[PDB]
Write a protein that binds this DNA or RNA. Structure first.
Ligand SMILES: Nc1ncnc2c1ncn2[C@@H]1O[C@H](COP(=O)(O)O)[C@@H](O)[C@H]1O
Ligand SMILES: Nc1ccn([C@@H]2O[C@H](COP(=O)(O)O)[C@@H](O)[C@H]2O)c(=O)n1
Ligand SMILES: [Zn+2]
Ligand SMILES: [Zn+2]
Ligand SMILES: [Zn+2]
Ligand SMILES: [Zn+2]
Lengths: 1452, 464
RNA sequence: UUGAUGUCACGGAACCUUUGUUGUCUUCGACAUGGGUA
RNA sequence: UACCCAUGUCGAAGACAACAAAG
């Protein structure tokens, strides 16, 4: 007979579970099986299926109970109740049959020999051991024994590594399943005890059960008595609309919406405020789908909505990976396998006495995150994020026990200054750190805060090209700062309290120097122990030990709450205290320029609706998240590391060019390498005053047309910053005190920070246009060890030699073209950015800009300053400024012209089209194959819209569409008409022929908002516009007397008068089946372009009934059976048009109409092909780059692959504004009056390129001449006609400065040759009598500005800057010599540029204006565009006149 | 200039030719590699000269079957070059060369359409990568085991489809032998794969010779030893071949020429101890002793002479074999003194302790006695004495002032384990005793031996 | 779903390296439509 | 199957290209 003792185990932490092993591999020779012997096991119902439940082996509980009994017997001198306990026997002869042998020392309490092998009665400890099944430990399983699909259903496997102390890098790793105690806290089992077991043995067993504090890797208390459907819909929407390049952007943006469901309502609109956003209104649209999902009853919960967003983003990411070939993950060659400790099989035990003194000290506090933290835990099913944080199953942030123990061990080794060079396995290590750690108990903790982590984008910059390295782009989940974790630490030992090492470590933690998470180099994981309380319990005392046992050591919630009432406040004072190894350095950065830290994903969900916004981080203020603008620690660390590396050298080689393998340079010794941790840690920098971001609009200007380039119109939202109101950026970084006491490292850091303080290293992106300029940088806390290092008139511009003769009776064109030279100089390797090269110039150029004519630089943030669009002058914090981007582009154009270079901005893929005028085209019909056209023999006109016959009534829908043949009588005599039935008037001379009808609808319409001759002569009321084109009939005749020219006059409800002058359709007959002509794909592309132009026409007739079939019915491709006019060669067709007079599409893109050297160095694909077959390969870029390298402009101003070497800053007004028009308020001299401009219309390349002839090339670069039509505009009159300008929704009213306004700006140049700097200065200052053009309405006389160089400063060294005003003539001479070397005296483009830059002299006012459309529209009597088309501007000699500067087009 | 190399490759490229495709693939891989690591060659901002023809050539090359076949041929060519040039290259050069081959092939081996040449080269690349790890100390590197296991996995894919693949069967067995050397057990099907090799001949590789030797020792048959003996002795690695032939002669009962083959292997031996020959030589000596063949007593002494003339885990085992093989007590003292770095000399023989014998030998030399009895060889079991030392050492650290009891037991254990310390016959009374201990005996108090403390009868001095 | 006279697995920080960055003037005039007459 | 022209209106671009992790 026996007795059953029910056992219940309650877990207070996530316990560890080992993976299921095959029955043959459950032996001593399997390292993984032996390693997981201390963990919970997994049971499989069937050996071939993972379904099963977890359980805990009873042998593990028996071992824990035996260890607890040894400890208790050591405490009580080996006496339980009245009986005495022998030491016990832990030695067996057949050691090979035991799976595991004891490695630790056996505690000793008596010096007597163990009990005899055969004896009448055994000691209670021997009875517990089982020598006398007296005590059988049953297995522990879940209550009710449920079933789960697999181990992943109850927990997630997590990687645990072993970090080398010396290097700070993981030596190896191993994995284990962690099962959260919240989901599975209870495991139930039984203990069967024989009736012959003594009462003392039972009491010892009960005390050992109550004394067992941990099991299976966790502290325990033992008691005895839709998303996929949405993803499919979105993918189908993207595929149907042919917008699949936005898949990853949509994935990231949708995953960013998991913070709250209210973000869907705040998704950005288009720039007109309508639902036409390029992302959310692609389709039902994506915005509507997201809005429906947010309003779903199920997704009302925050957690369910977050899960929906995460799943949708993951599905879209997986779909986007399929577009690039699939999801391919690079795997480590070696070292990505788990390492398991191998225990040593020891023959005999090892008795060690630890004494009867044992005191347990409990420390309870809080660990508050002072910085964002990152505990790495990658989920194999989450591919979207590269770096992921550790979270609990309920999405709460977790402070793992393993990480806390590792950090504690690291800090103890740091305090002792003696690394533990021990290996897994063998007898326990006896070093002081290991001895302390074997008595340390830390509890796994989690946080109440559960908001989604923020994702930070990170990149690596190529030091040579200055751009992103190949494959260097990744995300990073970051836990917010301010999160509070409960902290409980217990030390059990023989000391009177905590060890001095532990006291010192805890005091370091209480000071805020608790670096406990990964990514510490970027300021991650700095905690502070707050509200710490401690108490020491003397377990040696019998009463205290009994009280400890009765309450289970106060491990549970109620026990812990009871124990916290008797904890003394504070921490023990360390007798031997050693100062922390890390020191904090405060940074104060002042910036007088806009700052942006790009966050493209946040800009896609922001209501502002911009291309990119600045980076913001979230602080955890209890249960709420606070967004704060900040400068990323990664970006600042990268900037500082680049500053250090580009200055110093290792054995004559710059630190930027080293591979850092087997390297001991100062870069690897301060910032670390891939083989060791760094010795400096940078934190986020926050702004002292929170600024409101402002939106700046940008556009790219084509070098040929002079207008906005296609697809290139953007804006950014940086943090505003001006000299009047600088941006104050504050923060701190931590440097190890061994580095801070090294003079060489302090010198290196001081040199780098002095270079940063001098403005050589701007912070953030878009530094080329004046962003991120650093005015000063302050350092405190270093005791001046690092802060120690941080500490002639310009010659007049030459007079111009260009002479332009202006005549009063002549009218000149607003713009002319500069014909480039045939030769473009290119170099394959530009200057690298990895160092300051010798023979290169670095510094700043201080310039002064003076306006010579009124200047218009609009502030387009508000388009209703004064429908009609009104703009004010650009301002930043109530200060009139000119953005650096406009100046950069203006100077770049002149630099590209002076140094004959490629057209940097040029729409190469544009395909031109020209209208036909009123013979080679022939009728045809597309064959059933669709690749051939069969020629028709002759055509006749079929009257359809007069009252002679009833063709619309008699004929059929198929017959009207032309799909089926028809029979109509045709007459030839000239009289070419085809009536279906012979008219009753003339019944003689008709012949019947079979053919097809080409009916496109009444489309020859003349529409106007005024009344013409035909409308005036109409008698009666004009009929309303009919709703069907089949019901339109002729109402009047243009030639009434002869009863010809039938027209249909109608009036619209909006006041438009329509005159349709078409009444006949064409009849195609006598088809030739033997004259099939092949359709090349080139002709198909041309016809597709013709259809695209037809369907997208701003000047189209408002009523669709007056459009052709291709435009009215939205024809998108050529189909079988179509009736078209075509021209053909011997075997193939050339041009296809749908109507008699239509557009002629160019055979080649406009990129092929210029020299192959003048095209952009890195441009698009103009050759016949797709180029999409090489997307997944790195050689596709080589087909988009010029074979010879980069032109001088692309080497200086940069390309997509090469960073530029010049930075243009904002230009600020120096004096009080002098406005062109006084304001309405005389008391406010800082705002000007409104002036209304004429219509600004798109440049037309078809004017410069008259036709398809190969003699028609790209004329060159467009420059606008200087004149004074702004006076006429100020008077309120049109510059061309002289009539008053009328307000319309298409023209603009602007606030413009006047002449005499001075601006000041600086240009920063790096690694410039002397000729490059000379040519840049030449392009800036130009010459006396020459001027630039800047801003809006350049063709109207606005924007003539002059730039004067005031000072040039050169960077001789990191510490010394020298004045460079003396070397300006030498630089100019070297630039001119370089120009002569490239082009030996054949500098004709320079003269043309100087003629176009020539500014009119005194008492010399040229008459410059665009011609009117027709001479009847010009009161001055000058010929219009139509008259010039066949007059002085014939296609034969139009480009010659357009490329000759100041060529009159009129002789009034 | 990688771009110029690609242009040159595309200038004259024929897509039916293996060499041109291999060169083009190598150029493209090198260009991509230089792009990835952000070298100085990333400053090349130029492109390809003839866009319409270069695009067509690249499109033809990037077609699936041509690209897949060219990758395997390129990997095989690099592996062939490495096998001949491995002696010339250094460790870093060899390590970088092998890892380049693995990366070039690893991106394609994951599919099911991969050819056997892709798997054979990748498995062979991993096998040679794992051989570059020098075993330092007793702990075997954990990445050598991973490399051999990774090579086996690639071979298992081919072997499942084709059980009798000639090349795949060798590499699978080559890595399986390495796993046993590291300490891992033989794979689950080692007996099957080894027996499939019986219907095969040597590929002249020296690793094949030891494969058939293991087959000889498993099935007890001697039907392959005759083929081994009739080999070419003009090869560079004659020492390894001679050692194998000695094993073949031993199973054929050619006892006379075993010494001759062993003499050449010992006399002509590589200087470096990291060579696998040294490990094989020690196993050869252990094999003779395990089979009770009274011949290892001569080879071991000769091997020690060469080893002394020239860390290595087997090195201490080699000294142990020389200590046991030598029957002269005076000579055994010199062997023990090398490792340490009335006179009583101590040497701890770990090999004999593992077998249950008295691994602790005490060498006492009394000059006043006759030459026949001048040297005495006293043997003791130090397993129990060592355990007593560990108990005192841990008790001293954990519980100070309570370890006096353990120290007394430890001192008494010395006399119980070494009864020849208080005997007048072993050591005459009233004479000084010099201590030169070995192993943990340096920390063991020898002058404090208690039975009566030792210093009451003799004086003690210590020499490190 | 373990045997038992022997489990330091609280014996092991997923750790270390990486700048959301490069390139771009809020700019600008001639086009759109397809027939009619003999 | 040879000639003849007629009408006077209207905004465009709204991001694009590369990197999408590698050691
Ligand atoms: N600290 C180090 N610095 C430089 N090279 C190293 C370092 N540690 C290892 N290596 C080399 O890098 C190779 C790859 O190591 P990885 O993989 O951890 C090694 O086999 C060594 O040759
Ligand atoms: N997964 C990886 C890959 C590389 N590394 C580091 O980068 C070094 C170079 O690895 P590559 O694969 O050659 C390694 O020796 C290691 O220090 C790592 O720590 N983790
Ligand atoms: Zn007992
Ligand atoms: Zn230790
Ligand atoms: Zn370095
Ligand atoms: Zn260029």
């Amino acid at each position: 007979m026996t007795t059953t003792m029910k056992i219940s185990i309650e877990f207070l932490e996530p316990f560890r579970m080992t993976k299921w092993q095959e029955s043959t591999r459950r032996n001593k020779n399997n390292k993984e099986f032996v390693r997981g012997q201390a963990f919970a096991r997994w049971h499989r119902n069937k050996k071939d299926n993972t379904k099963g439940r977890p359980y805990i082996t009873g042998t593990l509980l028996r071992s824990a109970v035996i260890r607890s009994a040894e400890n208790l017997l050591t405490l009580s001198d080996g006496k339980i109740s009245e009986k005495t306990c022998c030491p016990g026997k832990f030695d067996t002869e057949d050691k090979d049959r035991l799976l595991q042998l004891r490695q630790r020392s056996t505690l000793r309490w008596t010096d007597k020999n163990p009990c005899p092998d055969n004896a009448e009665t055994y000691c209670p400890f021997c009875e517990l051991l089982g020598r006398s099944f007296r005590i059988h430990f049953g297995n522990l399983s879940l209550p009710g024994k449920p079933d789960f699909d697999g181990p992943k259903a109850i927990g997630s496997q997590r990687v645990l590594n072993r970090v080398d102390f010396k290097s700070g890098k993981a030596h190896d790793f191993f994995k284990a399943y962690e099962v959260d105690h919240t989901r599975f806290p209870r495991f139930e089992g039984e203990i069967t005890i024989d009736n012959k077991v003594s009462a003392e043995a039972r009491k010892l067993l009960c005390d050992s059960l109550k004394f067992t504090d941990r099991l299976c890797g966790a502290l325990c208390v033992i008691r005895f008595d839709l998303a996929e459907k949405t993803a499919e819909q979105i993918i189908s929407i993207l595929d149907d609309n042919k917008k699949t390049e936005y898949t990853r952007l949509l994935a990231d943006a949708i995953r960013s919406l998991r913070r709250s469901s209210k973000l869907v309502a705040g998704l950005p609109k288009d720039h007109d405020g309508k639902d036409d956003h390029y992302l959310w209104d692609i389709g039902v649209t994506i915005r509507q789908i997201l809005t429906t999902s947010a309003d779903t009853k199920e997704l009302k919960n925050a957690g369910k909505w977050r899960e929906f967003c995460e799943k949708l983003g993951e599905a879209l990411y997986l779909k986007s990976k399929d577009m690039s070939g699939g999801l391919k993950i690079t795997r480590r060659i070696l070292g990505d396998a788990e390492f398991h400790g191998k225990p040593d099989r020891l023959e005999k035990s090892r008795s060690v006495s630890i004494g009867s003194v044992l005191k347990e000290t409990v420390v309870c506090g809080e660990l508050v995150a002072k910085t964002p933290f990152f505990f790495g835990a990658i989920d194999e099913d989450a591919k979207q994020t590269d770096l992921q944080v550790l979270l609990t199953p309920d999405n709460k942030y977790r402070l793992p026990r393993s990480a806390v123990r590792g950090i504690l061990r690291r800090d103890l080794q740091t305090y002792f200054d003696s690394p533990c060079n021990a290996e897994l396995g063998g007898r326990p290590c006896m070093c002081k750190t290991c001895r302390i750690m074997r008595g340390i108990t830390v509890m796994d903790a989690r946080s109440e805060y559960n908001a989604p982590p923020e994702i930070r984008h990170r990149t690596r910059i190529n030091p040579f090209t200055g751009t992103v390295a190949e494959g260097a782009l990744f995300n990073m989940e970051v836990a917010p700062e301010g999160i509070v974790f409960p902290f409980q630490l217990r030390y059990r030992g023989s000391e009177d309290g905590l060890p001095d090492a532990l006291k010192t470590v805890l005091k370091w933690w209480a000071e805020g120097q608790a670096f406990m998470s990964g990514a510490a180099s970027t300021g991650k994981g700095r905690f502070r122990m707050e509200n710490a309380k401690y108490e020491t319990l003397d377990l040696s005392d019998e009463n205290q030990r009994n009280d400890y046992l009765k309450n289970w050591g106060w491990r549970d919630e109620k026990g812990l709450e009871e124990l916290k009432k008797r904890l003394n406040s504070g921490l023990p004072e360390p007798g031997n205290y050693r100062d922390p190894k890390w020191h904090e350095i405060n940074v104060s950065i002042e910036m007088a320029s806009p700052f942006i830290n790009g966050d493209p994903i946040r800009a896609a969900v922001d209501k502002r609706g911009t291309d990119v916004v600045t980076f913001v981080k979230y602080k955890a203020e209890g249960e709420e998240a606070k967004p704060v603008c900040a400068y990323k620690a990664e970006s600042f660390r990268g900037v500082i590391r680049s500053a250090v590396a580009r200055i110093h050298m290792e054995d004559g080689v710059p630190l930027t060019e080293l591979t850092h393998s087997d390297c001991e340079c100062l870069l690897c010794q301060i910032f670390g390498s891939e083989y060791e941790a760094g010795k400096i840690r940078f934190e986020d920098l926050v702004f002292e005053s929170d600024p409101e971001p402002v939106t700046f609009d940008h556009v790219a200007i084509d070098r040929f047309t002079g207008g906005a380039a296609d697809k290139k119109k953007f804006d950014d939202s940086p943090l505003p910053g001006s000299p009047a109101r600088p941006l104050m950026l504050k923060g701190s970084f931590w440097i190890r005190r061994d580095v801070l006491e090294d003079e060489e490292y302090c010198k290196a850091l001081g040199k780098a920070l002095a270079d940063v303080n001098n403005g050589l290293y701007p912070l953030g992106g878009k530094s080329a246009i004046g962003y991120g300029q650093v005015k000063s940088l302050g350092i405190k806390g270093d005791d001046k060890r690092i802060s120690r290092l941080m500490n002639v008139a310009v010659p007049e511009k030459p007079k111009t030699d260009a002479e332009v003769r202006i005549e009063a009776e002549k009218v000149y064109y607003p713009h002319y073209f500069v014909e480039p030279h045939k030769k473009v100089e290119r170099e394959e390797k530009p200057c690298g950015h990895q160092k300051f090269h010798e023979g290169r110039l670095t510094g700043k150029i201080r310039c002064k800009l003076i306006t010579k004519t009124p200047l218009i630089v609009p502030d387009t943030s508000n388009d209703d300053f004064f429908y009609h669009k009104s703009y004010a002058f650009f301002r930043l914090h109530k200060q009139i400024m000119i953005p650096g981007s406009e100046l950069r582009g203006m100077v770049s154009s002149v630099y590209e012209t002076v140094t004959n270079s490629c057209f940097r901005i040029f729409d190469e893929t544009k395909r031109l089209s020209w209208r036909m005028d009123a013979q080679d085209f022939l009728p045809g019909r597309v064959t059933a194959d669709g690749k051939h056209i069969q020629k028709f023999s002759e055509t006749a006109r079929v009257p359809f819209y007069d009252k002679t016959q009833k063709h619309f009534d008699i004929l059929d829908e198929q017959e009207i569409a032309g799909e089926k043949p028809v029979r109509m009588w045709v007459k030839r005599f000239r009289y070419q008409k085809a009536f279906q039935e012979i008219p009753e008037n003339d019944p003689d001379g008709w012949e019947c022929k079979e053919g097809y009808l080409h009916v496109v609808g009444p489309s020859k319409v003349e529409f106007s908002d005024k009344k013409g001759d035909v409308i005036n002569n109409f008698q009666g009321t004009l009929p309303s516009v009919p709703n069907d084109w089949k019901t339109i009939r002729t109402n009047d005749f243009k030639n009434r007397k002869r009863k010809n020219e039938p027209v249909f006059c109608c009036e619209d409800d909006k006041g438009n008068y329509y005159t349709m002058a078409k009444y006949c359709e064409t009849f195609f007959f006598d088809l030739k089946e033997n004259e099939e002509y092949e359709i090349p794909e080139k002709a198909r592309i041309k016809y597709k372009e013709l259809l695209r132009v037809y369907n997208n026409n701003p000047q189209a007739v408002p009523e669709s009934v007056f459009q052709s079939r291709v435009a009215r019915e939205n024809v998108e491709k050529l189909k079988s059976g179509d009736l078209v006019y075509f021209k053909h060669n011997e075997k193939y067709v050339e041009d296809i048009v749908p109507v008699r007079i239509s557009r002629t599409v160019d055979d080649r893109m406009i990129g092929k109409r210029m020299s192959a050297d003048l095209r952009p160095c890195h441009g698009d694909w103009v050759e016949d092909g797709d180029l999409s077959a090489l997307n997944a390969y790195p050689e596709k870029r080589l087909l988009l780059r010029h074979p010879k390298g980069l032109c001088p402009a692309c080497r200086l101003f940069g390309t997509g692959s090469y960073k530029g070497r010049v930075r243009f800053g904002f230009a600020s007004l120096e004096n009080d504004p002098e406005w062109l028009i006084p304001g309405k308020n005389p008391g406010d001299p800082f705002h000007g009056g409104p002036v209304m401009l004429s219509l600004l219309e798109r440049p037309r390349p078809t004017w410069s390129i008259p036709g398809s002839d190969n003699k028609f090339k790209v004329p060159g670069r467009k420059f606008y001449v200087h004149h004074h039509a702004w006076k006429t505009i100020k008077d309120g009159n049109h510059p061309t006609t002289g009539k008053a300008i009328e307000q319309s929704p298409n023209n603009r009213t602007v606030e413009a400065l006047a002449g005499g306004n001075s601006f000041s700006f600086e240009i920063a140049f790096e690694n410039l040759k002397e000729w490059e700097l000379g040519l840049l200065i030449h392009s800036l200052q130009l010459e006396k009598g020459l001027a630039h053009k800047l801003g809006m309405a350049k063709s109207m006389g606005f924007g003539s500005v002059e730039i004067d160089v005031e000072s040039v400063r050169l960077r001789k060294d990191w510490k010394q800057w020298r004045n460079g005003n003396s070397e300006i003539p030498n630089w100019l001479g070297k630039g001119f010599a370089k120009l002569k070397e490239w082009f030996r005296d054949e500098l004709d483009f320079i003269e043309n540029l100087k003629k176009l830059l020539w500014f009119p002299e005194g008492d010399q006012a040229p008459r410059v204006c665009y011609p009117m459309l027709r001479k009847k529209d010009d009161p001055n009597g000058n010929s219009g565009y139509e008259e010039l088309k066949d007059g002085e501007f014939k296609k034969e000699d139009r480009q010659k006149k357009l490329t000759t500067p100041w060529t009159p087009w009129a002789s009034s | 200039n990688p771009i110029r190399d690609i242009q040159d490759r595309l200038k004259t490229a024929k897509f039916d030719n293996k060499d041109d495709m291999m060169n083009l693939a190598s150029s493209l891989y090198k260009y991509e590699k230089q792009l990835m690591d952000s070298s100085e060659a990333t400053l090349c901002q130029q492109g390809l000269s003839n866009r319409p023809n270069s695009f067509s050539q690249l499109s033809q090359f990037r077609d699936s079957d041509i690209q897949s076949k060219a990758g395997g041929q390129t990997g095989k060519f690099w592996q062939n070059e490495y096998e001949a040039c491995k002696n010339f290259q250094t460790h870093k050069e060899r390590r970088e060369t092998l890892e380049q081959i693995i990366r070039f092939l690893q991106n394609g081996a994951e599919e099911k359409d991969a050819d056997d040449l892709l798997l054979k080269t990748l498995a062979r690349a991993y096998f040679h990568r794992g051989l570059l790890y020098r075993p330092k100390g007793f702990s075997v590197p954990a990445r050598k085991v991973e490399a051999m296991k990774k090579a086996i996995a690639y071979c298992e894919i081919i072997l499942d489809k084709n059980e009798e693949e000639s090349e795949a069967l060798r590499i699978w067995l080559y890595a399986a032998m390495e796993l046993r050397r590291c300490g891992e057990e033989y794979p689950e099907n080692f007996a099957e794969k080894l027996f499939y090799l019986a219907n095969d001949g040597f590929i002249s590789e020296l690793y094949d010779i030891r494969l058939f030797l293991e087959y000889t020792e498993r099935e007890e048959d001697n039907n392959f030893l005759d083929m081994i003996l009739q080999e070419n002795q003009d090869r560079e690695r004659l020492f390894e071949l001679c050692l194998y032939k000695a094993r073949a002669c031993f199973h054929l009962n050619q006892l006379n020429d075993v010494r001759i083959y062993g003499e050449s292997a010992i006399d002509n031996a590589p200087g470096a101890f990291a060579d696998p020959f040294w490990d094989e030589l020690v196993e050869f000596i252990r094999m003779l002793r395990n089979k009770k063949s009274e011949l290892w007593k001569e080879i071991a002494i000769k091997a020690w002479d060469k080893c002394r003339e020239k860390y290595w885990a087997r090195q201490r085992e080699l000294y142990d074999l020389a200590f046991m093989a030598q029957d002269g007590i005076e000579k055994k003292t010199r062997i023990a003194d090398s490792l340490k770095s009335i006179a009583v000399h101590f040497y701890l023989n770990e090999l004999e302790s593992h077998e249950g014998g008295k691994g602790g030998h005490a060498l006492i030399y009394d000059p006043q006695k006759a030459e026949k009895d001048q040297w005495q060889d006293k043997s003791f079991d130090y397993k129990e004495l060592h355990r007593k030392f560990l108990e005192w050492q841990e008790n001293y650290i954990l519980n100070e002032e309570g370890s006096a009891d353990f120290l007394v037991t430890l001192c008494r254990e010395i006399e119980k384990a070494m009864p020849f310390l208080f005997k007048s016959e072993v050591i005459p009374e009233d004479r000084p005793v010099l201590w030169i201990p070995h192993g943990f005996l340096h920390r063991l108090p020898l002058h404090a031996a208690m039975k009566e403390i030792f210093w009451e009868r003799h004086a003690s001095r210590y020499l490190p």
